[PDB]
């Protein structure tokens, strides 16, 4: 059972491919629930983390990260702790949630992720939100709006080239508009924990921002896909890869960020974006506080 | 949400969390434990997990009784001591470490638990 000593399953090109409709997800062990040592959401996201261990990440200094949907009914943030944990000890962590909490982050921001005003670009935007309403199933399940919206809007305008996402989808927590943006970004997959493997969750991974159309993607084809995957794909439950944590922390890449125009952009900085060797955006002071809206 | 209302209506938050606990109330759940190579130094409070193999880490925000509380904090500089940090528990106190940390203090030559890893 190798699988079961990795973080968790990638959606593979074999099924990235596939030209089929949007059918139900039925996982043989749906909401299973494995021991833990600690809340699940440790285990998941350190998993995660493992995941975009093995992505090419761009690391800098002052490496700015955000994160959505960090806190809980518990009024408490694991998932933030454990990017603490996993991120350089400089980099800035910038986390939100409707409802108030506490957390290890540098700035955290009460309310709607709309109410978030990013002044600068960042480098890693992690999502774990998903709206209650979204159980509510009623007739056919079509791309959702919601948090999608804002989440998209910050991909096309304050995320870094060379940056990367990670935004929690479900089987019907899911949007057209992000998976296409994913074929803006020099790599995508979906990532699914071994924590959590009884869950349609998973987690959309946009790797290297490049601002521009690489991949064409019909995004309601792809989630059908995404859902013919998770429906043949046998998923154990497992935290086996938590084992040997000694590689645990994010490799200190030392990414440098340069600031160029579109028209300086040639085949080398792509490239050397599409590596995670590089981020182009401003070097000024991160400024995220809370818009009051109308 | 029962001890979290009681260090609300008293001007010593401490001991009033320290007389309940004390007097057999169930201390503060849902401390953000983390999962750790027990190979660390074994401080008190660290950026980066550093806990033994006698020890445990947790989330700094999460075992501070006035980060728990949203109540103001009674350092002078006004900053927490814990928050965006990790705490190191030992592990037979990890029942209430909210607790541990408002009856220890690390030692500030030292930076070890007074009592659980201090040797001065
Ligand atoms: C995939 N599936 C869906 N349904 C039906 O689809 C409807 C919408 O799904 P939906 O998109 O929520 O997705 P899932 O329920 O995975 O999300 P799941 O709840 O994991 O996760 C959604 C959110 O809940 C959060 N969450 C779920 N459990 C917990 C928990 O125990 N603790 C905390 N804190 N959060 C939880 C989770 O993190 C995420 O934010 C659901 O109501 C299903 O009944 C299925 N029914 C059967 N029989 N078999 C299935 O395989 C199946
Ligand atoms: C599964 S929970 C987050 C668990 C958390 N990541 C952890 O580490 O335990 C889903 C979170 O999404 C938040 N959320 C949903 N919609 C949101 C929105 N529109 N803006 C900000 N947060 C939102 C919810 O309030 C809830 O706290
Ligand atoms: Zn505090
Ligand atoms: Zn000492």
Known sequence: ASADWKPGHAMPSLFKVQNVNLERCELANYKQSIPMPVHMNIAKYMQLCQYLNTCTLAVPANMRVIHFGAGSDKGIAPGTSVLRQWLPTDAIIIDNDLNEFVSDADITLFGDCVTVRVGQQVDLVISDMYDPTTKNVTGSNESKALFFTYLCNLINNNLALGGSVAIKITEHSWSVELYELMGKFAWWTVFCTNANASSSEGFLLGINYLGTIKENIDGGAMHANYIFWRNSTPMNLSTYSLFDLSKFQLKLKGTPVLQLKESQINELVISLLSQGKLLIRDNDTLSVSTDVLV | ?120
């Open chain 2, 1 to 120: 949400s029962s001890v979290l209302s009681l260090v609300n209506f008293t001007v010593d938050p401490q001991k009033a969390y320290l007389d309940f606990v004390n007097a057999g109330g169930a201390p503060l759940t849902n401390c953000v434990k983390m999962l750790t190579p027990k190979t660390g130094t074994g401080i008190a409070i660290s950026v980066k997990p550093e806990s033994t193999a006698d020890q445990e880490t947790y989330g700094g925000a999460s075992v501070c009784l006035y980060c728990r509380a949203h109540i103001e904090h009674p350092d002078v500089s006004g900053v927490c001591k814990y928050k965006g940090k990790f705490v190191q528990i030992p592990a037979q106190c990890v029942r209430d470490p909210v607790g541990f940390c408002l009856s220890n203090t690390p030692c500030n030559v030292c930076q070890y638990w007074i009592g659980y890893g201090c040797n001065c």
